[PDB]
Swiss-Prot record, chain A:
This is Splicing factor 3A subunit 2. It comes from the Eukaryota. Component of the 17S U2 SnRNP complex of the spliceosome, a large ribonucleoprotein complex that removes introns from transcribed pre-mRNAs. The 17S U2 SnRNP complex (1) directly participates in early spliceosome assembly and (2) mediates recognition of the intron branch site during pre-mRNA splicing by promoting the selection of the pre-mRNA branch-site adenosine, the nucleophile for the first step of splicing. The modification N6-acetyllysine is found at residue 10. The lineage of its organism: Eukaryota, Metazoa, Chordata, Craniata, Vertebrata. It is found in: Nucleus. It comes from Homo sapiens (Human). The modification N-acetylmethionine is found at residue 1. The chain holds residues 1 to 87 of 464 of the full protein. Belongs to the SF3A2 family. Component of the 17S U2 SnRNP complex, a ribonucleoprotein complex that contains small nuclear RNA (snRNA) U2 and a number of specific proteins. Part of the SF3A subcomplex of the 17S U2 SnRNP complex which is composed of three subunits; SF3A3/SAP61, SF3A2/SAP62 and SF3A1/SAP114. SF3A associates with the splicing factor SF3B and a 12S RNA unit to form the mature 17S U2 small nuclear ribonucleoprotein complex (17S U2 snRNP). Identified in the spliceosome 'E' complex, a precursor of the spliceosome 'A' complex. Identified in the spliceosome 'A' and 'B' complexes. Residues 1-27 are annotated as: Disordered.
Swiss-Prot record, chain B:
Involved in pre-mRNA splicing process. As a component of the minor spliceosome, involved in the splicing of U12-type introns in pre-mRNAs. It comes from Homo sapiens. This is Crooked neck-like protein 1. Widely expressed. Highly expressed in testis. Not detected in brain and lung. Identified in the spliceosome C complex. Present in a spliceosome complex assembled in vitro containing CRNKL1, HPRP8BP and SNRPB2. Component of the minor spliceosome, which splices U12-type introns. Isoform 2 seems to be predominant in the spliceosome complex. Interacts with PPIL2 (via the PPIase cyclophilin-type domain); they may form a trimeric complex with HSP90. Belongs to the crooked-neck family. The chain holds residues 216 to 283 of 848 of the full protein. It is found in: Nucleus; Nucleus speckle. HAT repeats lie at residues 7-39, 41-68.
Length: 84, 68
RNA sequence: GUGCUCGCUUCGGCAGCACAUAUACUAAAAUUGGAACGAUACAGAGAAGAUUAGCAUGGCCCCUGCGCAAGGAUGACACGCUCGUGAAGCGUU
């Protein structure tokens, strides 16, 4: 057989991860991307709870997902209200 | 403390020699090795390092300037 | 050792002549220092999601191969350099 034209595979691989492992890896990567964009934007309103949840201290609003806080950018009117 | 200092100096010299052997023409590795040898008060070792660097590339101004 | 003597002369030998002229890492040893990489253990498969084909490039890194062929995880290994502070020299005051 064409050994140099078979699809590539290596011994001792372990296989492809399941849906749950890929889902939690995607969630961890989304958390890392959200933290990278928060550190790039340098927003001090972001906080992580003791139970591990996103919180807007300028809005005082909890967020279930990272994109919930990423869409929380109302926040300008709440920042103007909490400025004084 | 003397054996730990000897192991640290051996590790630093091994990394400097590996950085020299990886890229010979990069003279900043030679300058850093010679300044680290001069900082440990080894005049003839740094003189041998500078002479090796001048044998590698004698046309550089900064090698002559730093060795003088 | 062999052969022969205008020998000494017994019949054995002596003497003389001629030929033949330099082996061995000299050990049947005492020593000495280097190690296959197998067992256990450490260990953990390149390319910014995952599964991955690879060709190179450098040399105090090698192995398989008869190789100027081809393999060995792509054989392995092989990233961080726009302003002030001082000093020296030069020309003006
Ligand atoms: Mg990848
Ligand atoms: Mg090939
Ligand atoms: Mg190859
Ligand atoms: Mg292969
Ligand atoms: Mg491959
Ligand atoms: Mg290669
Ligand atoms: Zn907010």
């Amino acid at each position: 057989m064409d050994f140099q034209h078979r699809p590539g595979g290596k011994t001792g691989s372990g296989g492809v991860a399941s849906s749950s492992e890929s889902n939690r890896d995607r969630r961890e990567r989304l958390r890392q991307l959200a933290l990278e964009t928060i550190d790039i934007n340098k927003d001090p309103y972001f906080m992580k709870n003791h139970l591990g949840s996103y919180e807007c201290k300028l809005c005082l609003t909890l967020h279930n997902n990272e994109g919930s806080y990423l869409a929380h950018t109302k926040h300008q009117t709440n920042l103007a209200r909490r400025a004084a | 403390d003397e054996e730990e200092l000897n192991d640290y100096k051996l590790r630093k010299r091994k990394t400097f020699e590996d950085n020299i052997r990886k890229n010979r023409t990069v003279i900043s590795n030679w300058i850093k090795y010679a300044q680290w040898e001069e900082s440990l008060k080894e005049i003839q070792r740094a003189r041998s390092i500078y002479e090796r660097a001048l044998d590698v590339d004698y046309r550089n101004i900064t090698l002559w300037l730093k060795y003088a």
